[PDB]
């Protein structure tokens, strides 16, 4: 009906007008008075050399020492990063995995991919082996991200345009978030784990309430598919890296884009983004085989992590902020300090 | 400088390393084929010869083949096609009888053009199956090729029409040097399609070995 189309157009115009009214000064104008962090020199302290294919995801344990990594050789490897020892190696039923999660308690890990199933594996069993605790099915597209809320609750994003909050005890979708129009590629949980942001292929990100399930706000501005999303440590902002070779920082309360991190040299898209412990550094993995450490406040390239011979696919920062792990499309993970 | 527990942990890590190495060696001896088509093209029959992604394992002359039919994956192909960067070959199935309408033949043509001229599948070879040759013959005897191809100069002969379609598909290749296209005419036929696949992947493996040595 034309009346619905006109109402939607006027509502979008009102949203744009309200956002413009709430904007008075760009974050760069306010921030430029502060001292730049200078050149950020980081060296490869450790190199994890166990995988045999492209590494697609990695996640840090909450103890900032154990990390789980997934590659398309059908293996989930739990590494002790301090000693480069392999704590665990789990054979996956489906070798096509694009996501990987570590439970905050450290008892479980999660995996998923082109098989449209989120597999939860129990790491702490009396039998002494890692076994599949539960397979969650109900997504009609590939699983792109999964994040543990606790030992019993997980939230998954899929290429079937929808997100789902599950219940591992029963394996049923407790909540379904359906607001996107393209494949959802990333997922970031808020520090309080009551909200989460999802970035999809319609060049938009959406903020969902976990408790009941609603798209509270929608953030646009990207020119292509958003591949990565990460919450600011404060929890009042987030950053999205997309295929148009740019990262963007949005603010929840302002409901607006705060900053754009881009450079004319960079023409390749971003595969992963993460923040430092204080939020001053925004780390972004690129397809040009390098990672860029941006000054999240001043939008300047504070440093470059150039140690990978292929596209950097996954990137994470420890909970204590001591190190950053990057996994790329070669079979190597690197720890930087 | 390592305590007893640290030494035992290192030993366990080395055992895990050995198991991973053995698993990777076993996996590297497997031919990975990416199966593609336009739905009713006839992928089901080809799979018969030998929710998300579907895997088919078979064996031929002591060679282990893994065929990955991503055919009920109705998402953005660009977001997951790079996962198959590195397969031995792409088996593309097209129905010769699907040139009637509902355009289908052109749909297969555009899908083949998109797959062949891809950044990831720059060096991967494509085994092209043109199946349902009997229904193609039956349709040709009654209706001409001109509905699908207005700029076609030929009679209602099976051989000439089939050859014209084959070259029409083979001209979609842009990188006609680094990638080779193998064409077979199929039809719910004798086991000759598995032999054709084996021959094509043998050629691809010879080329890959020559690349590895470095002469190429």
């Amino acid at each position, epitope marked *: 009906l034309d009346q619905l189309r006109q109402e939607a157009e006027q509502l979008k115009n009102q949203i744009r007008d309200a956002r413009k009214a709430c904007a008075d000064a760009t974050l760069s104008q306010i921030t430029n008075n502060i001292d730049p962090v200078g050149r950020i020199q980081m060296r490869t302290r450790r190199t994890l050399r166990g995988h045999l294919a492209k590494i697609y995801a990695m996640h840090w344990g909450t103890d900032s*020492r*154990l990390l789980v990594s997934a590659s398309q050789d059908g293996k989930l490897i739990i590494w*002790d990063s301090y*000693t480069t*020892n392999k*704590v*665990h190696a789990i054979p996956l039923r489906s070798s096509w995995v694009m996501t990987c999660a570590y439970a905050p308690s*450290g008892n479980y890990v999660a995996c998923g991919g082109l098989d449209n199933i989120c597999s939860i594996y129990n790491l702490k069993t*009396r*039998e*002494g*082996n890692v076994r599949v605790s539960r397979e969650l099915a109900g997504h009609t597209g590939y699983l792109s991200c999964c994040r543990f809320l606790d030992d019993n609750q997980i939230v998954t994003s899929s290429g079937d345009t929808t997100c789902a909050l599950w219940d591992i005890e029963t394996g049923q979708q407790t909540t379904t978030f359906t607001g996107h129009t393209g494949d959802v590629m990333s997922l970031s949980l808020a520090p309080d784990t009551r909200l989460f942001v999802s970035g999809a292929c319609d060049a938009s990100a959406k903020l969902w309430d976990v408790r009941e399930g609603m798209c509270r706000q929608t953030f646009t501005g990207h020119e292509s598919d958003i591949n990565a999303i990460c919450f600011f440590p404060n929890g009042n902002a987030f950053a999205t890296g997309s295929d148009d070779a740019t990262c963007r920082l949005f603010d929840l309360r302002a409901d607006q884009e705060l900053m754009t991190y881009s450079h004319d040299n960079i023409i390749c898209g971003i595969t992963s983004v993460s923040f430092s412990k204080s939020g001053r550094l925004l780390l972004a993995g690129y397809d040009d085989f390098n990672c860029n450490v941006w000054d999240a406040l001043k939008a300047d390239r504070a440093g470059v992590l150039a140690g990978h011979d292929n596209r950097v696919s996954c990137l994470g920062v420890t909970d204590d902020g001591m190190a950053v792990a990057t996994g790329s499309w070669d079979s190597f993970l690197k720890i930087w300090n | *400088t390592l*305590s*007893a*527990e*640290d*030494k*035992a*942990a290192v*030993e*366990r890590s080395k*055992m895990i390393d050995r198991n991973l190495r053995e698993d990777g060696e076993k996996a590297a001896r497997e031919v990975k084929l990416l199966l593609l088509g336009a739905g009713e093209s006839g992928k089901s029959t080809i799979v018969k010869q030998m929710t998300g992604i579907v895997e088919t394992h078979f064996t031929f002359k002591d060679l282990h083949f893994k065929m990955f039919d991503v055919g009920a994956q109705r998402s953005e192909r660009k977001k997951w096609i790079h996962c198959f960067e590195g397969v031995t070959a792409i088996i593309f199935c097209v129905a010769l009888s699907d040139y009637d309408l509902v355009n289908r033949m052109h749909e297969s043509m555009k899908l083949f053009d998109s797959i062949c001229n891809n950044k990831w599948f720059t060096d991967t070879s494509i085994i092209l199956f043109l199946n349902k040759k009997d229904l193609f013959e039956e349709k040709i005897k009654k209706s001409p090729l001109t509905i699908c191809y207005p700029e076609y100069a030929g009679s209602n002969t099976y051989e000439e029409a089939a050859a014209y379609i084959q070259c029409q598909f083979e001209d979609l290749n842009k990188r006609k040097d680094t990638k080779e296209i193998y064409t077979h005419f199929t039809c719910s036929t004798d086991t000759k399609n598995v032999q054709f696949v084996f021959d094509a992947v043998t050629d691809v493996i010879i080329k890959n070995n020559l690349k590895d040595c470095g002469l190429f």
Partner: single-chain antibody
Amino acid sequence: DVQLVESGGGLVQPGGSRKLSCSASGFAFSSFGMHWVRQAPEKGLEWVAYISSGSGTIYYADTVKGRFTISRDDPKNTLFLQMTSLRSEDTAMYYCVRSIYYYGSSPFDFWGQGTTLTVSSSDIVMTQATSSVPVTPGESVSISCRSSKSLLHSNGNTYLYWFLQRPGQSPQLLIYRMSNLASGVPDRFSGSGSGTAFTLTISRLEAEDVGVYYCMQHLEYPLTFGAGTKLEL
């Protein structure tokens, strides 16, 4: 059901060549390093031998080196201890402890039932001082254990283990690495201390908590135990 069953004990003449077997059922036996730990009748536990996962590493006590041999049959899920030139000092009950080693693991977590064996007729010293203290339900008791060498390693781990042996039962792991409470142990047990001085505290002691408490070091082989403190009343 992570049970370990022991067989091959009995009466052996001196100089005999009796062999003990240990059947494992309910866990991935191939991934566990396995120990033989003996206990003389009126004595405490004493570590005998250890075989790693994959049989790549083997250790023996100085009292059994050259006469004992430990081995595994992983497909059969069995652990063997072949003992030759048996002497009267080898009269003991033998246990078949399992221990897996990775970051955060809890070694020595499960013990077998033990096989009795009766023969006819640089090491770290761990001192447990007190040998018997009477207790009453509801109270809190602190069991002390001193070490000759500092068990605190350069990596931050203090390799001290606390085991409890109830009357007429097999020892069970209470604490591993001096602070971590083993799975299934009630929270009333706690472990603290520093290098060469450790203490296991039982707060609000009750029934089924009486027995002999042993402190063991895993800093280096051979592993050594304390004499044990008995809890009665």
